[PDB]
Design a protein around this ligand. Structure first.
Ligand SMILES: NC(=O)c1ccc(S(=O)(=O)N(Cc2ccccc2)[C@H]2CNC[C@@H]2N(Cc2ccccc2)S(=O)(=O)c2ccc(C(N)=O)cc2)cc1
Ligand SMILES: [Cl-]
Lengths: 99, 99
């Protein structure tokens, strides 16, 4: 699809068998989701921007469906105020900026 | 043009006659620039980041160019991790997300 930016570009995603709403975010290097369980190893990291930093757990090689597009990538999990899809997964679904 | 997302979508902008590097950020509702001088009166504005909400300065009807595309709109000034071109100006220059 071609997604307008008059409104936030929100999509439904499927991860861990659960459906969620997430923001397509070209400003974010990596994907960040609210607290949830995920399988496998993880390691802690801090991410930040306006207003500060939060602690997250970095899981790699996680499978995700975005708009009916299957991808594999890193997912950061932590107290984010909004679910974010970052460049690390936007590339995999072939997403580009166009004007 | 068409901008892929394997690296940060950093572009050159022009504002107050100066060239600056800025990030095209579809997760940002607004346009937020590093501390700088702008003409006219400003208004207070709250924005929310990963870490919380903060107060910044809002200037309206400011001329700004993005990759050479001229625009006039709202520009926020505050402690941002990088110059950010957000949805208000991305919309104005006709930018969409595509996959
Ligand atoms: N209202 C506005 O205009 C506004 C909103 C919010 C901001 S922000 O400063 O917060 N900011 C920009 C930013 C932050 C850090 C580096 C480059 C650019 C967010 C917008 N899109 C990317 C950022 N994030 C997603 C997000 C957070 C909050 C609201 C909407 C979207 S995030 O969760 O900070 C994050 C950080 C870092 C990483 C990582 N390291 O991978 C991933 C995710 C600025 C302006
Ligand atoms: Cl505007």
């Amino acid at each position: 699809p071609q997604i307008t930016l008059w409104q936030r570009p929100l999509v439904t995603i499927k991860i861990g068998g659960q459906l969620k709403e997430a923001l397509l975010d070209t400003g974010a290097d990596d994907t960040v989701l609210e607290e949830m369980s995920l399988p496998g190893r993880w390691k802690p990291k801090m991410i930040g921007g306006v207003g500060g930093f939060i602690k997250v757990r970095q899981y790699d090689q996680i499978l995700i469906e975005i708009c009916g597009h299957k991808a594999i990538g890193t997912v950061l999990v932590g107290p984010t105020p909004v679910n974010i899809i970052g460049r690390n997964l936007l590339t995999q679904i072939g997403c580009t900026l166009n004007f």
